[PDB]
């Protein structure tokens, strides 16, 4: 029934808006859209100031922890999610949040850099590439993914449903009851397909193209966690370890 | 029009049957009760292994050979995909380089069940437990392929579905280093329309099978990525082990 599918779409859109402060629509206005208060631009060490690589890294960590809580709130609004086994809800968020972070990060990126701090700042791609060894390879693969992903020209109403699809995967390790998860994801996939078909009537197979982006996305996450483990041999703040 | 898409699907199934000597139909026939006109000989230990005729490397070289053959069969198939041989020659190479192992592991699932895998064009059957028990790191080689295959075969796809899916894999366009992405995209969009119709027609009760199948491309990518890491280990522990130049060229 096309009626519960669009009820589902609107529901997810509304809660996406509620949960995530900076929407793609707003970010685009600030980015390549040329809006009311341009972002402060960080393009070098001097602009940054107004111990670099580490403090940038730690700032990204702070932001990612905030993002985990926004994503968590959003997840609990996906119909059926809270009714799942509690351990499974934890497992889904645990393995899903990285994929979602980089997906949503794309909304704040163009080929030349990324919005930071509620959209108040813009950090250039080239500046990020110029960071001391380990740290300069951090964001580059995320930029490469973002350019490809942004070529799809999704809006927030599309992204809301896609994010929900990622969360309800089914193949996360250690899941206790895979069936209701895949049943919910089947429904979200139906709602996503219909959404892209209505929202983007002239973009053939947009649904298929979007699902294929998950392949690059998961590689990116795998490579990132690999990198994350290498900085445990670079610099090796009490209660702070624990927070992160 | 739906009709053009059916004709494309028929052409691809046809080319598939002509390119790949052991179909899923035949493999499932061998694996199940079924056709007991050609029951396979089963390899589950060393002694049965020599009846069928180091132990771990010999099997690995046997498997390298099957890889180089599979690259040929896949290349012959790729040529049948409408538009493929018209592409920039460099992009033909790139598509094959990145597509070949994702296809090999897709098709390998057709030859597997939870218990083992068909070998030697279906004349033999090698146990999953036997493979797992191989020395060193050779025992870790096939196990994630089995894990994928038991999940992949739960989609209950047949050869007519697989023919189009395998073409979609080849014509990716998010492949690294492609010169002209647009014509590749146009071909894949046709192939995807063809695949979506095929699944809706062949599996009308199977909800969102199309999406579920596309999601499996994530599993394939991860299998390849892990398999490459395992090979880098093998070549450094066994300095006397030889990898085929074709395969070396595919890997980076
Ligand atoms: C497309 C036809 C599929 C034939 C299936 C062959 O079964 C295989 C299963 C595994 C492998 C495999 O991992 N080969 C490796 C590779 O090519 O990197 C190594 C052994 C050469 C090769 C073949």
Swiss-Prot record, chain A:
<protein>
    <recommendedName>
        <fullName>Peroxisome proliferator-activated receptor gamma</fullName>
    </recommendedName>
</protein>
<feature type="binding site">
    <location>
        <position position="98"/>
    </location>
    <ligand>
        <name>rosiglitazone</name>
    </ligand>
</feature>
<comment type="subunit">
    <text>Interacts with FOXO1 (acetylated form). Heterodimer with other nuclear receptors, such as RXRA. The heterodimer with the retinoic acid receptor RXRA is called adipocyte-specific transcription factor ARF6. Interacts with NCOA6 coactivator, leading to a strong increase in transcription of target genes. Interacts with coactivator PPARBP, leading to a mild increase in transcription of target genes. Interacts with NOCA7 in a ligand-inducible manner. Interacts with NCOA1 and NCOA2 LXXLL motifs. Interacts with ASXL1, ASXL2, DNTTIP2, FAM120B, MAP2K1/MEK1, NR0B2, PDPK1, PRDM16, PRMT2 and TGFB1I1.</text>
</comment>
<feature type="domain" description="NR LBD">
    <location>
        <begin position="4"/>
        <end position="244"/>
    </location>
</feature>
<feature type="cross-link" description="Glycyl lysine isopeptide (Lys-Gly) (interchain with G-Cter in ubiquitin)">
    <location>
        <position position="18"/>
    </location>
</feature>
<comment type="function">
    <text>Nuclear receptor that binds peroxisome proliferators such as hypolipidemic drugs and fatty acids. Once activated by a ligand, the nuclear receptor binds to DNA specific PPAR response elements (PPRE) and modulates the transcription of its target genes, such as acyl-CoA oxidase. It therefore controls the peroxisomal beta-oxidation pathway of fatty acids. Key regulator of adipocyte differentiation and glucose homeostasis. ARF6 acts as a key regulator of the tissue-specific adipocyte P2 (aP2) enhancer.</text>
</comment>
<comment type="function">
    <text>(Microbial infection) Upon treatment with M.tuberculosis or its lipoprotein LpqH, phosphorylation of MAPK p38 and IL-6 production are modulated, probably via this protein.</text>
</comment>
<feature type="binding site">
    <location>
        <position position="244"/>
    </location>
    <ligand>
        <name>rosiglitazone</name>
    </ligand>
</feature>
<feature type="binding site">
    <location>
        <position position="224"/>
    </location>
    <ligand>
        <name>rosiglitazone</name>
    </ligand>
</feature>
<comment type="similarity">
    <text>Belongs to the nuclear hormone receptor family. NR1 subfamily.</text>
</comment>
<feature type="short sequence motif" description="9aaTAD">
    <location>
        <begin position="238"/>
        <end position="244"/>
    </location>
</feature>
<feature type="binding site">
    <location>
        <begin position="61"/>
        <end position="64"/>
    </location>
    <ligand>
        <name>rosiglitazone</name>
    </ligand>
</feature>
